[PDB]
Every structure is written in C-alpha cells, then in structure tokens.
Design a protein around this nucleic acid. Structure first.
Ligand SMILES: C[S@@+](CC[C@H](N)C(=O)[O-])C[C@H]1O[C@@H](n2cnc3c(N)ncnc32)[C@H](O)[C@@H]1O
Length: 93
RNA sequence: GGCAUCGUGCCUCGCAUUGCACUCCGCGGGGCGAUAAGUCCUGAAAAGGGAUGUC
C-alpha cells in the first residue's frame, strides 16, 4: 500500500515476552536504517503485531521488501506499511 | 514491614484471538514494586517513582 515511515508487522509468535520481542525487532531491523521507536503490546487487540518506526521511508521500504516472510520465532513475518503515520512522525510534519 | 483500598503496568497457564496502534485492559486461574514495564505519579527538562489510609 502507500509507503510510510512505519512498517506494521503481524503474524508474530505471541509467546515472546514484550521486552524480548521489542529488542529482537530492534536488533534485526536496525540494519535497514535508524529506528525511532518500536511499539509492542500483548493485549488481545495488539498481540502478535508490532509497529517499527523508521527515521527514513527508504529504510522502511527496503526493510519491508527484504524481511518479508522471514522465519522469526518459528513464524514467517508478514510486513505491510502502516495505514497511518505514527504520532512521533506526524508531530514533526 | 502489616492490614485495607485505588492508579500504573509485567510474567505465567487453559481456552479464545491474524488483530492498524500511539485515545492502549479478551475471559478464567496463578504470581507481582521489581535496576522490568508503565498509558499512572514527581519534575521545566535531562531523569526519577507506586499512592492513600491505617498499626
Ligand atoms: C489490585 S492488584 C492490581 C491488579 C491490576 N490493576 C488488574 O487489573 O488486574 C494490586 C497488587 O498488584 C501488584 N501490582 C500492581 N501493579 C504493580 C506494579 N506496577 N509493580 C509490581 N506489582 C504491582 C501488587 O503486588 C499489588 O499487591
């Protein structure tokens, strides 16, 4: 869909603890660019999914194209662009 | 430290969940101030932290 600073990742293994997931996502995705923040909740609506906020869209695009489907804690990651700017990014625009 | 109450969030099990958030709580059982986390609180920010009542 329309390119965004923030990639939306779901199909994540819901048994990973909040901290380990967040840092794993940071460790993996920081090759593709500078990460402003990563947002992870284990709530019913928000489990199995994460927002990764890149500083540059080029990183997000390259991240999404390159990591798509990657086996991650025994599930393949599904990556889409976020439907919407993260507050941290829009608060700048 | 103990009682009792409330804010905040974390871990864990069963069942359920593929879910687009930053305005944030699946139901049920268990364990929690703890250099964790926090959406709550202090502070102008860096940062720091449960609070109230009670013996
Ligand atoms: C009434 S319970 C809170 C339950 C929670 N508010 C809920 O919706 O299920 C109070 C107890 O939870 C524990 N607790 C709540 N917040 C905590 C925190 N941030 N850190 C450590 N323990 C906490 C404490 O052990 C306290 O004795």
């Amino acid at each position: 869909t329309r390119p965004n600073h923030t990639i939306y990742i779901n199909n994540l293994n819901e048994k990973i603890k909040k901290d380990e997931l967040k840092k794993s996502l940071h460790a993996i995705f920081s090759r593709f660019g500078q990460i402003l923040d990563i947002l992870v909740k284990r709530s019913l609506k928000m489990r199995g999914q994460a927002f990764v906020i890149f500083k540059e869209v080029s990183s997000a695009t390259n991240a999404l194209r390159s990591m798509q489907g990657f086996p991650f804690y025994d599930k393949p990651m599904r990556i889409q662009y976020a439907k919407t700017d993260s507050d941290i990014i829009a608060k700048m625009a």
